[PDB]
């Protein structure tokens, strides 16, 4: 349940936290509460595919999609600002 959230080109701020009322909603609320410059609806979540490419998730579906794609034992997240 180990999360490492990269605020983004390159990484500009990195925040780490644990995380197990939708999943995607709970996580995006965790991310919105942890990054001072972030407010709800103001950002886009991403994960990386095995090919390396960034891909937006925005629902519970695309979230488990993202999780399958994360095998480290560490779930990685990439946030862009709208």
């Amino acid at each position: 349940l180990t999360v490492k959230a990269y605020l983004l080109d390159a990484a500009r701020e990195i925040r780490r936290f644990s995380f197990c009322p939708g999943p995607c909603e709970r996580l995006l609320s965790r991310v919105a509460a942890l990054f001072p410059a972030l407010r709800p609806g103001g950002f886009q979540a991403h994960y990386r595919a095995e090919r390396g490419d960034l891909v937006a998730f925005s629902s519970d579906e695309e979230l488990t999609m993202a999780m399958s794609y994360v095998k480290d034992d560490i779930f990685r997240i990439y946030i862009k600002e709208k």
């Binding site: 780490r16 936290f17 942890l34």
Partner: protein, 88 residues
Amino acid sequence: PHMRVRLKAHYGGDILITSVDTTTFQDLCEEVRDMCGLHQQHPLTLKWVDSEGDPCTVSSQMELEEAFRLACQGRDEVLIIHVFPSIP
């Protein structure tokens, strides 16, 4: 659970260091401000560098808690926290 914190404050061209022995995000902030002779409200940025060498910003108890967890997993003996007071 928690472990000693080595506070490294990068301020005024110096690297000020103290140790602090549970531990809360607020106590760390107060210790840094006292060490640097800062006003109670002086904004700080605190970061710990992880196993992949990434600086990770901690601005809360939850983040501090995660740094502690990950420090225990690594069987480290002290958690190093880097601190950067804001420059007016």
